[PDB]
């Protein structure tokens, strides 16, 4: 990592890690319990302007979501304008009920709601097809569907003021394996990520759904992996 903004790990408990990666954005990392490999890390993104934030992805469960919400409200001293699960799997949406219990507006791609309901998961209350821009303070965030890949509903988040891309599980960390393909369209995945890369050429940081963030190289790696 050689970004002009030197990343800072500003919070660490047994269950949640916050890593500041730009002046006003932060990776949230929590864990998914798998009966096979123990706890595996899962990422989301917090963006902030003044005393307002937007969160991409929930932790897998309400307890960790509550820890995250209380950290934002209690330590970042900010309101949460919105939460945006980037796909229907638990590592993006499993802890959504906690956000609803705080009356935090939730948004996802329409297909995320459809696939969530098919699995009797709690789903967001608002939907879009195929992008939305939401205000955070005097800035905005983009949430957009570019095509199928890891799942058929996966969306990405972009914070243009700091050129931060939250790729979600559509994006892989460098050298990652292909991961869980049970819900994937591997035929479209590379083309989808090519579209993301074309749309955000000035990207500075790319955050994958699991593992280590980096720069545009994660886009190139993920494209190549699925060709
Ligand atoms: Zn997934
Ligand atoms: Zn994932």
Author numbering: 7 to 233
Give sentences copied directly from the paper behind this entry.
Here, we report the biochemical and structural characterization of two membrane-bound MBLs: CJO-1 and CIM-2, from Chryseobacterium joostei and Chryseobacterium indologenes, respectively. The structures confirmed that both proteins adopt the characteristic αβ/βα sandwich fold of B1 subclass MBL enzymes (0.59 Å root mean square deviation [RMSD], over 220 Cα of CJO-1 with CIM-2), with two Zn(II) ions in their active sites (respectively). Specifically, a hindered access to the active site with the contribution of a Tyr residue in loop L10 and the presence of a positively charged Lys residue in loop L3 limit hydrolysis of cephalosporins with charged C3 substituents.
Aiming to understand the substrate profile of these enzymes, we crystallized both CJO-1 and CIM-2 in their soluble forms and solved their X-ray structures using single wavelength anomalous dispersion (SAD) from data collected at the Zn edge. CIM-2 diffraction data extended to 1.56 Å resolution, and CJO-1 to 1.34 Å. Among these substitutions, the presence of a lysine at position 59 (with a positively charged side chain) also modifies the surface charge distribution of CJO-1 when compared to NDM-1. This surface charge distribution is likely to generate repulsive interactions with substrates with a positive charge density in their substituents, as in the bicyclic β-lactams tested with positive charges in their C2/C3 substituents, e.g., cefepime, ceftazidime, or imipenem. We generated the Lys59Leu variant of CJO-1, and we determined the resistance phenotype of E. coli cells expressing this variant. Despite other features that can fine-tune the reactivity, we conclude that the main determinant of the distinct substrate profile of CJO-1 against cefepime is based on the electrostatic repulsion with the positive charge of the lys59 residue.
